[PDB]
Design a protein around this nucleic acid. Sequence first.
DNA 1: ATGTGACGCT
DNA 2: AGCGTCAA
Length: 425
Amino acid sequence: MATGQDRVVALVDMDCFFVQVEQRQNPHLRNKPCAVVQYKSWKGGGIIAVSYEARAFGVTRSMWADDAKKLCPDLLLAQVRESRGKANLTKYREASVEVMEIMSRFAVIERASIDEAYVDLTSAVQERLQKLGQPISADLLPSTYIEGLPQGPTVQKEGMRKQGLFQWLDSLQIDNLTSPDLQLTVGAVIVEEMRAAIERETGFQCSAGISHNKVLAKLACGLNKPNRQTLVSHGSVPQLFSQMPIRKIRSLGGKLGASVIEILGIEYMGELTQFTESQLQSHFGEKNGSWLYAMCRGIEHDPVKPRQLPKTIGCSKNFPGKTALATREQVQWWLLQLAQELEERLTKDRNDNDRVATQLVVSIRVQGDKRLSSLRRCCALTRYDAHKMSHDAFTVIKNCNTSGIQTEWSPLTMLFLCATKFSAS
DNA sequence: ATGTGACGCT
DNA sequence: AGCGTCAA
Ligand SMILES: Nc1ccn([C@H]2C[C@H](O)[C@@H](COP(=O)(O)OP(=O)(O)OP(=O)(O)O)O2)c(=O)n1
Ligand SMILES: [Ca+2]
């Protein structure tokens, strides 16, 4: 029996992260229907983050502020810092590197997103079981939800959870330390603990998902939001997946999952457990078949990586519709500004992490082209110089102008510089 | 006309 | 090397 209960993986996401960061800075926005805005010019600005009070009005990410004011009239709005013509997210990066430092103190983290990190707690948990030859109280888990529980023979929201917790806390075997359920339970305490520190030392709230692998830890987190954690066990999986849409799983949100639906003619994840391993390999490849077969039975061996630091530093600028760049001088100018921000971020990164980028990546967009990026060329980053970068960034794309006149440009919907291929310093 | 970053594939 | 997929 290849348990599928080898590791203990947690996943922590900050609840309406960007909003909180503003709410902490501006006290007047806390416990208020509010949102983070970007570029007031076009339609009051596009929304990139929504407080959960404003999520009651139906305000969502990717929506113009003017339109959201029609749903939530008294929607308080914070604005994003702007840098040389573009939005600047230095505040949330600096606010993110805060939380990572804290999660690091407990265990090794994989920076999935800016407000997310994965934690492999196998080592840490076992090193607690020896120091705790004794039961586990419910008071050590005041925000933990046991998925699937309760059931059988407690009316409102926190009325339950308690029962599901109690029903669970009885069933577990504190005697058997190899008991995977016991491990997750202990991890949840450890997760509860680090969460409390995050809120104490930053003032920020977050949800967490605890399970045996990364993908389940992900889904578990999003189950009970906000400021709650959810424990998904091996036993919760079959009953859970049977009603759980496939689109609601990492990687399966894309067109892969779309085909998987219409190819096999299904809806939920539990319906994959029928098909053999070789069948799913026959449709989606040896890699996907092996993965889907394991994952539909709640198994995934994609490991948590010691990667608290990114591998690519980049900044983008989009020029939608008639705002496209049709001169060499606009392009020359913007590439500079883009390279200017990239430089100070690089010199920053260097002074903190003691490392340097070596290869400059340039990427563009044209009009009448759907895909996010059309062309993309590497360079060679040797000097953190906002000019040498952009000048070379121009050089590696100077040819792209299809105009007979050199002063113009034929046009760009987007530009994207990216410093990568790092090296130790 | 919403506006980074990681990874797989050829 | 360049492009495609996926998600925050
Ligand atoms: N397409 C996106 C996705 C995220 N973010 C920013 C804003 C988010 O606050 C933060 C993380 O977004 P999440 O998807 O993790 O979810 P939220 O933090 O917005 O709230 P919640 O966790 O309650 O869903 O990164 C963004 O600007 N654009
Ligand atoms: Ca979030």
